[PDB]
Amino acid sequence: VAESWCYTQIKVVKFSYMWTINNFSFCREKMGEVIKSSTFSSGANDKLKWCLRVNPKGLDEESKDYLSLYLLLVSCPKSEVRAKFKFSILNAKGEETKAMESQRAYRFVQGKDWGFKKFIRRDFLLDEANGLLPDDKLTLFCEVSVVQDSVNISGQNTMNMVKVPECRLADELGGLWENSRFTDCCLCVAGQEFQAHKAILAARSPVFSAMFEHEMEESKKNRVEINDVEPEVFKEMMCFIYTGKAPNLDKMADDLLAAADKYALERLKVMCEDALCSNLSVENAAEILILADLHSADQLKTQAVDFINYHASDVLETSGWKSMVVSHPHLVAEAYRSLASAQCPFL
Amino acid sequence: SGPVAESWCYTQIKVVKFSYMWTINNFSFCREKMGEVIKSSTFSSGANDKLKWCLRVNPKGLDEESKDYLSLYLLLVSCPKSEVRAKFKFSILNAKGEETKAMESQRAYRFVQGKDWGFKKFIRRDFLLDEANGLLPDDKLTLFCEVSVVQDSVNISGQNTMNMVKVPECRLADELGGLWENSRFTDCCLCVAGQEFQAHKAILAARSPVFSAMFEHEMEESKKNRVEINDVEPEVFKEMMCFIYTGKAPNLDKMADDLLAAADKYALERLKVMCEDALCSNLSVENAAEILILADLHSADQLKTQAVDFINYHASDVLETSGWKSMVVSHPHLVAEAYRSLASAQCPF
């Protein structure tokens, strides 16, 4: 898992220095209050100025015991100079030990000298048994390292994968219907004249396949005559055939069920039955049952029979019921058989 | 049992969870002191830009109680003021990228801008400073946090059903397939290096712009029936035309190498992207060079970017492979792009 890394690497600058006096045993001469060192620098254009002054003799009370070593900031424009100095020895003979260091640093400022007053006692340092006077010389080493806080990273480390656009066949065929490119037949409906591609119609609608497949193209293909259906219902039907979707079906379920049953669109038939099924009011179940019987819509017929059985007490007062009994005895017999063997067999 | 049971009330609790890794090089070299502040980079979820979180740690915890314990918080940087809340966990990693130490806040703290709440006093410093503990590889501290803002406040009263009519699926791709394999009185004669295919004009023209430019222009007058495709092998042209009709290619990963070239030749954007997805999911160091040269050759973009990312990560071993040497001999500018990507991925050094 990964969403954003910010390394913000703390800026670390490091550099070295050395200090050799060839006559340490006799380097006192002037009683050793302080040795003014020659400055040194490094880094960006020698912008940081540094010098190491030593008070080898006893300027203070306890300084007779312990030898001295200090770091002095000769100059720097920025007041805050915080540096982690590591005073030590570059092993003239074999000695890498004996070099303590101060982890804590201090805010060095222009002209200020902050260091430590306590390095090592005089007597055994002067002694040759410890090997601290190689050829009457001694080497020092401060790893003066300065840091500052202006560092950040943004980072994303995004764990991304290639995205496939969703299927566009329905859109790329609807846009073919609305544009009418490379058409091959002209559907005729009630003054309006549509123009459509023979292959997709015959594929989705078997009744369309039947009247093209039988080798009457120039008779039928060029001027196939659909004389029953009206403009907007037929337009919706073609939109279903081409795109597989019926947008404004809910307000036209009746006549579109008729049209869909004509051409055996056995899914648009069920969509029309779904629109009609959740519309059954108490006073229209006669008409909807007449529909479902006439156009062989089985599921709507079953649901309308159940609705009439469950609203019999209300439906029989409606004039539509009287009309349907007048015209369709066998529908009344079917509803009767439906509530004969169910939704009543307790008495 | 009584299944179904009418409604489907399905109240949700939207949980946005995202991760954040915090890593300082040479952590215990200086890292300041006393109270101070190492304010981190503000970070969001990634989805949209409205919530802004950030870590904030002090190697020397503020106040004396947090002297031996590092003081860690988590502050709301900025957001459209709604008093957002979150439950959060802070976890420490190592070089091998496995969780070493992890603490999770028990409850979702309520947050507003300027108000912070976190694992104060989260761990004793001495445990971390233990070099034998192994939690400071290369002197570099690493930290990892997961913020789990939750708002809830979403309910739906199910769907009451109350109807039983079975509209069966959608079948458009299925019978359009029936127009191809059964071939159902097609219109234009295609030919692929000897084979004989019979396909339509309208579906090809709609779903493949190169075909539409091909078919609309001057073959309608003379040679609309016969057009020869002498560029792609028929055993993959069949899957091209089984995408153009039914909008899917089942046996694609067997031959996704050349199908990318075919799809990009005829500007089948969706199939080109599917081929990129099939090539992207089988990358390997032995052939990342070939995939990069391909994804440049056939103008692929996402596969080019992902092959670039893979080669940046696994540059260690690809150079020993012959694919890289062929790539450098043949395609210098690809090496220039990969080198540029690696350079930007390591800008601050």
Added chain:
Amino acid sequence: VDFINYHASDVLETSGWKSMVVSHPHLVAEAYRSLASAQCPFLG
């Protein structure tokens, strides 16, 4: 090579680099090797 790696974000802009991209590929390959194998990892 070490210099151009350290100044890469500006060196890639220069005309000399854009001439060396064509006139000398293996130099860019070796610069890539020194950037990849002789440095890294950097998070990822």
Added chain:
Amino acid sequence: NAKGEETKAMESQRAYRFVQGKDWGFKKFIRRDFLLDEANGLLPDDKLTLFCEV
């Protein structure tokens, strides 16, 4: 019944009068940790599905 559980839930042994603005039920069903215990099959996808019959 995601996994097999048609048991473990109590039943109302007596019919209580329900009035406008009032609530009724019970409160002593199952322990919270036991509920959150996946061994009992009571955290499908960190979701709780209910089968109430009124």
